[PDB]
């Protein structure tokens, strides 16, 4: 009788249809019924990354009990959800435990978020009297419970995966009517597909269905603000996912055949030349969006190398620009530090727990020469299988990321001097697993003028705070090309030439007067240097 | 089961004392002696092998001809010595020595589990003596109740919930709505899953 005062009653709320219908997941329900009906130590724990549905399984169990699809010795046993917030203390807890044990096992207790239970129930758990069902996140578990290894032996970890769109579309079609009544607006089912589709490739920090309900809610609120267009639609969902996360800035809904038709030429606005090694990078994206790709292999795993100062890092940051609308959402690890045989352990991990959250990021590997040939052994099952492990025992799948490898071997080999040097360090079981090894060339002084245009456009966009337009004449614009010289160091000394010619006298004339906001600062060819 | 701390000695040293001195022949229980703190055993130590204790008034009450009985649940499934060596953990050897033959109960056999159903149904027949309401139980149902008596972890206790879930529910519904009156006979018959009326 004492449980009337310190508990709710999910069965009593289920007996009037006040629970959202639970669709899917027969395996977890059968597993909970299997574990909860053994003889001793009969108390499972639901564990998964948050948002994948763990309360929904217990509510589905309550629905299935009140319906009656259970076996014989589980029928009509009400699930009394306990508390520890609402709950002299030791007397009260002993009264609760005595009231549970006084019954004949007719009650299934339910402590939700049981990682607060640490802060006298220990002998009662192992004997098998009180049946207990819980739900933790995966990462509060190892902080609050696994510290206290006497407790965690008396549980049964029931892992629950997570993701899925096809059932979330049904959930969103179900809960459509409730928000139309609170906010007096209509919601169109055309937008209700997009609010779950578009919320998977952009917002990759929370888990699923609750993340795809906040968009509908905040879109309805913004529409009520504008009605202070009589229904929401697929545009305001994009407005919300722009204004939060600032994802609209980069791309702004850029995705369709019209984009991927122009990718060899759209990418040329930031990389000049190198044409035979953009027509291959621009091909592992088109064949993976047509559906011809090999379903157990990374979508593209290719290695490009050559001399220095060519654009081999600028390319791998430019094809991460229109896929993501940013340039910092990529896994950039640097293997220039793994000289010894025991820095494997920092990625086996720093490599692992940055993919499992959003499994779509492009991955760099900068200067793979300096790694000791033990890191290649770790990298060997990344290619051609797609999975590796870690301490926790999960096999993270690299089946749809674009691996990219950089190098500087040889750096000036004729035709085979650079290619046969690869065969020195790399064992042939690693050269075979790669895609087409790309060679970059040097740079031509015919194709070196336009880099100066790009650099001066960059410096113009840097001075957008001051509204300080600057005028560059064509004789100076070709004067900067001729000091771009000596094709050993690439186009990198040009980006010091610009800061030695323009930036010095401009930075002196900027902070002493005679240059102010909105002014125009033209440059003119003095007979040796650049004037002002 | 309530003497977890060291100062509930005083309620029996008393509630134990002034219930014997009146009629010195009653049998005495001690239910679940595991949960007592090992200070209550010290009070119990001169009860055994001498027979007398004291109280505030200064009288030595004699336990020389009562039958002491101690219950426990230690181990609960030890093979042969797993249950016996667990006794040696909590009890000091000056207390195990003073006892008589430590008896071990076994579990229950499904051969010796049919007759408990006979006892339970005779009990429920004697409960309905106010209504003179005889009830007829056939032998296929009488052996049907044995097979749900199962899983020898919880003993014969779930059978005494099985009887009240099978017979008592539909009988209690058919008792207070008509069609069952005093002196009538209510037979039970094996419906293909449950028990009918």
From Swiss-Prot, chain B:
User: Where is region (C-terminal) located?
Assistant: 108-197
Compartments where found: Cytoplasm
**Role:** Part of a stress-induced multi-chaperone system, it is involved in the recovery of the cell from heat-induced damage, in cooperation with DnaK, DnaJ and GrpE. Acts before DnaK, in the processing of protein aggregates. Protein binding stimulates the ATPase activity; ATP hydrolysis unfolds the denatured protein aggregates, which probably helps expose new hydrophobic binding sites on the surface of ClpB-bound aggregates, contributing to the solubilization and refolding of denatured protein aggregates by DnaK.
Family in the record: Belongs to the ClpA/ClpB family.
Subunit structure as annotated in this protein's UniProt entry? Homohexamer. The oligomerization is ATP-dependent.
Q: What does the comment on domains in this protein's record state?
A: The Clp repeat (R) domain probably functions as a substrate-discriminating domain, recruiting aggregated proteins to the ClpB hexamer and/or stabilizing bound proteins. The NBD2 domain is responsible for oligomerization, whereas the NBD1 domain stabilizes the hexamer probably in an ATP-dependent manner. The movement of the coiled-coil domain is essential for ClpB ability to rescue proteins from an aggregated state, probably by pulling apart large aggregated proteins, which are bound between the coiled-coils motifs of adjacent ClpB subunits in the functional hexamer.
> What's the name of the protein?
Chaperone protein ClpB
Source species of the chain = Mycobacterium tuberculosis (strain CDC 1551 / Oshkosh)
